[PDB]
Amino acid sequence: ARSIKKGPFVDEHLMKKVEAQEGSEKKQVIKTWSRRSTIFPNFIGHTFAVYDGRKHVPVYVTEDMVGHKLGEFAPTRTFKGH
């Protein structure tokens, strides 16, 4: 993917509203669309509400998510069986 010489890509507002309660009491779920931003260690503990197209479905960021994208953990298609 992106490169060694470019960084990770995080969408510039998924950090500010996360580094805005840097030192705060509690964690309320964060309302997102940016499924495309990578996950830093900083998020560890957060439960974001990402967008899978019609509903914000929530997942809580843990420490085995810490190299992934935000939207690998939110289905877009629905398929129960044939």
């Binding site: 060694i4 960084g7 990770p8 830093f40 260690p41 085995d64 810490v66 190299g67």
Partner: peptide, 11 residues
């Protein structure tokens, strides 16, 4: 994982 991330980049 957390350590791997920082190592690859610089953080």
């Amino acid at each position: 994982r957390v350590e791997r991330f920082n190592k690859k980049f610089g953080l």
